[PDB]
């Protein structure tokens, strides 16, 4: 069917993406009737409280609070599992990873691939990468688990900063020359999926809808896209409260 | 033994005489009268009864005809569905 779609030369890229978006939504046989949103509600709320810091030490500290008995979050089973994972991940990778997630939010897409080319170059020289790959993939788990440069995160003192070394360009590594000079700070066309907090927020801060009326605003705007009612309903369960009673609903922040 | 064939496309599927064209009920009585005259004679007395039956025929009224049979209407509904088609 995509092969049959013959656009006009004078159609903008927006019109072309709209024709393909409407064509993909015709072959949808519905989402599972019983499978529920995995990262939603309690777990989704916990992620926003535990992964909002700028230090992996504080993140793990917050997870221990959730896993503790009596935590009002109710995600004890989830928090305990994530902790058992982070301990196995490379401690250096966690610092470098958490650092780029905070910096990449202000980078351009073209500037991103250039910085990562420098970062990746530093990992080839590092010890964890060569050890993790040789121990897990080449050995297929044999010879026991991996052995990172620091045995754990406790070896890295608070004042230590093992990230800046990776975010510093190396003059011996030429800058990555891209195939074109295009770039942008945010995806120009990334609103063809389900509505997220950004979409629901804009609709609330713009209009004055209600609990049920707001859900129908998206179910109609997306022309019956499977999962909109479940997604919009979840977003309101977390980031929306009856600030005006049953009349309308606003965000919980303020 | 084979089964009935599937009729080819016809211009119209119908029966010629829908209602049975029954015969005059007395033409049989006259034959009986004519049968006695051949065996018992004309001016005989044995045929005196059959003659009375023959005279009773024409003195009685003619039964009214039956309503038309709607067979041909239903044959025309199922023609294309029962045969190989309909000729134009």
């Amino acid at each position: 069917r995509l092969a049959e779609l013959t656009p006009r030369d004078y159609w903008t890229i927006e019109q072309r993406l709209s024709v393909i978006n409407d064509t993909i939504e015709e072959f949808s046989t519905g989402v599972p009737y019983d499978e529920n949103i995995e990262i939603g509600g309690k777990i989704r709320l916990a992620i926003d409280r535990c992964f909002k810091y700028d230090k992996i030490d504080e993140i793990i500290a917050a997870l221990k609070e959730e896993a503790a008995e009596g935590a009002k979050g109710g995600v004890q089973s989830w928090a305990k599992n994530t902790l058992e994972e982070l301990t196995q991940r490379s401690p250096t990778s966690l610092h470098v990873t958490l650092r780029q997630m905070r910096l990449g939010k202000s980078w351009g897409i073209a500037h991103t691939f250039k910085r990562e080319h420098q970062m990746a170059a530093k990992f080839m020289k590092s010890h964890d990468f060569n050890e993790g790959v040789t121990a897990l993939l080449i050995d297929k788990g044999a010879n026991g688990p991996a052995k990172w440069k620091p045995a754990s995160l406790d070896e890295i003192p608070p004042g230590a900063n093992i990230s800046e070394d990776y975010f510093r360009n190396d003059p011996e590594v030429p800058v990555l020359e891209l195939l074109n000079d295009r770039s942008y700070m945010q995806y120009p066309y990334n609103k063809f999926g389900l509505p997220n907090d950004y979409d629901v927020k804009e609709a609330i801060e713009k209009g004055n809808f209600t609990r049920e009326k707001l859900i129908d605003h998206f179910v109609e705007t997306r022309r019956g896209k499977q999962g909109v009612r479940e997604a919009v309903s979840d977003v309101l369960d977390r980031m929306a409260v009856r600030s005006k009673g049953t009349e309308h609903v606003q965000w919980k922040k303020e | 033994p084979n089964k009935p064939i599937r009729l080819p496309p016809l211009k119209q599927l119908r029966v010629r005489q829908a209602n049975k064209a029954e015969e005059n009920p007395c033409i049989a009585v006259m034959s009986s009268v004519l049968a006695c005259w051949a065996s018992a004679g004309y001016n005989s007395a044995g045929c005196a009864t059959v003659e009375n039956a023959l005279r009773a025929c024409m003195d009685a009224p003619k039964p009214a005809p039956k309503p038309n049979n709607t067979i041909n209407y239903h044959l025309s509904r199922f023609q294309e569905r029962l045969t190989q088609g309909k000729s134009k």
């Binding site: 049959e4 779609l5 709209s18 | 049968a35 018992a40 044995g46 045929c47 009864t49």
Partner: protein, 224 residues
Amino acid sequence: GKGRIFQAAKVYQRASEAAATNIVSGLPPRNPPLWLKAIESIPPAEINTRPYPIQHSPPNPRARKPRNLFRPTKIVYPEDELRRDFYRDHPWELARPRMIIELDGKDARFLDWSKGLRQRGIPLSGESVVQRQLWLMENQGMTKQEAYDKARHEFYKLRQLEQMERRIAVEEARMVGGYFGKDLLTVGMELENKTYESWKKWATTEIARQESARASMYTNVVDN
């Protein structure tokens, strides 16, 4: 070719060309039909192309020049063999009326044949035995005969309680002043009476035809 030339798949191409220019050369074209821009980006789908249909059963490998390649194939499931076995051992199970009318098509969402024959939404029927048998014959590794006997015996004990409850339910109702209407045994006989009479009238009126036509066969009209 008695058929006519249908160009329904090219209404847009034909309509858009007729609207491109004006018949009065030297003037701008008039406004096109209102539907032209509506289906501008919704072209028709390909038709009349014969694809290789879904093969519900393996095609004959020994065939060297196979025919009927573009012919849809028969849908067959492992349960077809089981349904035929059960309903042939229990022909009168077909007399129990079954409603094949669908309600919402969501029957298979509450069917967990690991529990037993009694499921949600569907009645206890020969289908339950086939589904229960198939589950045992696949999960518990039982054989066709072993799984058949198990699901088959569970099915009998349930039917027995259904028949024992009708009799007892009516017997106790009368012990406390409960009366009922006519039953099929009585209603069924009355219908036979009314139909038997119709036959008696036909036979009585049809026998008079033979005896009269028979006696009149001889030409005894002379009255000697």
